Scaffold this active site. Structure first.
Site, PDB file in Angstrom:
ATOM      1  N   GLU A  35       0.878  -1.202   0.000  1.00 15.48           N
ATOM      2  CA  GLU A  35       0.000   0.000   0.000  1.00 15.48           C
ATOM      3  C   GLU A  35       0.891   1.220   0.000  1.00 15.48           C
ATOM      4  OE1 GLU A  35      -3.189   0.365  -0.582  1.00 15.48           O
ATOM      5  OE2 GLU A  35      -4.009  -1.567  -0.171  1.00 15.48           O
ATOM      6  N   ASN A  46      -7.317   8.540  -5.655  1.00 13.69           N
ATOM      7  CA  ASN A  46      -8.125   7.508  -6.285  1.00 13.69           C
ATOM      8  C   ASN A  46      -8.896   8.178  -7.460  1.00 13.69           C
ATOM      9  OD1 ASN A  46      -8.844   6.574  -2.908  1.00 13.69           O
ATOM     10  ND2 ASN A  46      -7.540   5.433  -4.287  1.00 13.69           N
ATOM     11  N   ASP A  48     -12.003   8.160  -8.023  1.00 12.99           N
ATOM     12  CA  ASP A  48     -13.234   8.778  -7.582  1.00 12.99           C
ATOM     13  C   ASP A  48     -13.049  10.184  -6.939  1.00 12.99           C
ATOM     14  OD1 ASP A  48     -12.349   8.180  -5.002  1.00 12.99           O
ATOM     15  OD2 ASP A  48     -14.117   7.022  -4.469  1.00 12.99           O
ATOM     16  N   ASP A  52      -6.026   8.231  -0.566  1.00 14.09           N
ATOM     17  CA  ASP A  52      -5.618   7.261   0.431  1.00 14.09           C
ATOM     18  C   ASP A  52      -4.389   7.829   1.116  1.00 14.09           C
ATOM     19  OD1 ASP A  52      -7.567   5.427  -0.457  1.00 14.09           O
ATOM     20  OD2 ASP A  52      -6.101   4.064  -1.287  1.00 14.09           O
ATOM     21  N   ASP A 101     -15.384  -3.871   9.372  1.00 18.34           N
ATOM     22  CA  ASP A 101     -16.559  -3.350   8.644  1.00 18.34           C
ATOM     23  C   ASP A 101     -17.350  -4.359   7.807  1.00 18.34           C
ATOM     24  OD1 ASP A 101     -18.156  -0.925   8.248  1.00 18.34           O
ATOM     25  OD2 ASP A 101     -17.334  -0.686   6.276  1.00 18.34           O
TER      26      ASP A 101
END
Ligand SMILES: c1ccc(CCCc2ccccn2)nc1
Length: 129
Positions: A35, A46, A48, A52, A101
């Site tokens: 990552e 990202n 969208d 991050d 989650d």
């Protein structure tokens, strides 16, 4: 801060990630490697519009506030910049929420594509932990 592999394994263990929700320490280290390359200051936009942040690439769409992700939530109740600190405490606490989650570590794109199904213990081989 650019963590050494074992240095990070020790920090994550200290904060109670080894085996958190059943994920052994090596999963977390392998995740971090792919990552962030073990860099607390890593940021990546990202498609969208979200970004991050940090050692585990925690996303502003859901988890932290960066002031420029419309329609996003801040479920860890943290500014995204707190996720870039040399001290990983905030990233770990937030990650514990993420992994709880519903989808486990599949929330981390790179974990699923590069760590899942691999010999993740290798990532902590040679560490005094
Ligand atoms: C966006 C682009 C790149 C990165 C680098 C780390 C690997 C990764 C890829 C995709 C999603 C999440 N993690 N992070 C976000």
């Amino acid at each position: 801060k650019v963590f050494g592999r074992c240095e990070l394994a020790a920090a994550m263990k200290r904060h109670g990630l080894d085996n958190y929700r059943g994920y052994s320490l090596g999963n977390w280290v392998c995740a971090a490697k792919f990552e962030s390359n073990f860099n607390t200051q890593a940021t990546n936009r990202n498609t969208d519009g979200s970004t991050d942040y940090g050692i585990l690439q925690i996303n502003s769409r859901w988890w932290c506030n960066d002031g420029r992700t419309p329609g996003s939530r801040n479920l860890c109740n943290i500014p995204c910049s707190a996720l870039l600190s040399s001290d990983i405490t905030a990233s770990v606490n937030c990650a514990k929420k993420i992994v709880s989650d519903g989808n486990g570590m599949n929330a981390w794109v790179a974990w699923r594509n590069r760590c899942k199904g691999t010999d993740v213990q290798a990532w902590i081989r040679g560490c005094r932990l």
